A paper describes a structure:
We identified two virulence pili independently critical to [name] catheter-associated urinary tract infections, the chaperone-usher pathway pili Abp1 and Abp2. Further, their respective tip-adhesive proteins, the adhesins [name] and Abp2D, make use of large, distally oriented binding pockets to adhere to glycoproteins like fibrinogen, a wound-healing protein important in CAUTI pathogenesis. We demonstrate that [name] and Abp2D RBDs are structurally similar, and each binds fibrinogen and other relevant host glycoproteins important in CAUTI and other infections. These proteins share a common binding mechanism, using a large, distally oriented, and flexible pocket that recognizes a complex glycan receptor.
When determining the Abp1DRBD structure, we solved two molecules of this protein in the crystal (asymmetric) unit. The structures of the two molecules of Abp1DRBD had a backbone rmsd value of 0.176 Å, demonstrating that they are highly similar. However, while most of the binding pocket was structurally conserved, one region of substantial variation was a 10 amino acid stretch (R86-S95) encompassing the anterior binding pocket loop. Compared to molecule A Abp1DRBD, molecule B’s anterior binding pocket loop was displaced up and into the pocket, moving the α-carbon of S91 by 7.9 Å in the >50 Å long structure. The rmsd value of the backbone of this region was 2.275 Å, indicating that it was substantially distorted from one Abp1DRBD molecule to another. The anterior loop’s flexibility is significant because this loop can change the shape of the binding pocket, which likely affects protein function. While these two residues are conserved in the Abp1DRBD, they are too far away from each other (>4 Å) (in the crystal structures) to form a salt bridge in both Abp1DRBD molecule A or Abp1DRBD molecule B and the loops are more closed than in the Abp2DRBD structure (especially in molecule B of the Abp1DRBD structure). An R86E variant of Abp1DRBD similarly abolished binding to BSM as measured by enzyme-linked immunosorbent assay (ELISA). Though [name] and Abp2DACICU share residues critical for adherence (R86, R102, and Y141), Abp2DRBD has a higher affinity for fibrinogen than Abp1DRBD.
Residue numbers in the entry: 1 to 167
Amino acid sequence: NCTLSKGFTTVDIPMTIGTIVVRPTDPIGTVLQKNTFTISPNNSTATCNRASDQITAALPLNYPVSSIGNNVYATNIPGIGIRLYREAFDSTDFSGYYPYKRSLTPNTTYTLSPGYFVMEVIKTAATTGSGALVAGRYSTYYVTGQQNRPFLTTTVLSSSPILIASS
């Protein structure tokens, strides 16, 4: 099981993105929009004591994978998928696409690494809808037994909608 440092504090990234225009001529699989957000960690750490303990990168809205697979997940907007990941500032240390699990080394102290959180909005069908992406927590990153206290969350806010405009 995993222990968190005293004063452990989740970092949340509001995902604010301007209007994404989808055109009929955009082929299926097009990355319509790719946004990077700075991951700015604090001194929070986690230490675990069992080799079965895990770090989990999860998508709590629990939408199904889209028709095109490849970790492109459906949204409330037909034909519009999202894909999430993290990377170092120098673009290395690719986290892998959400969701994933990774085994943790017992007695290693883990921190949140700095870098970019990457959100891609991707066309997944010939016909695409219009509207705001549903608001809420789009990703979470937490250790075993500490799902209530993640290292990192990303959130779409009601007050800052991500609008899909299809023409």
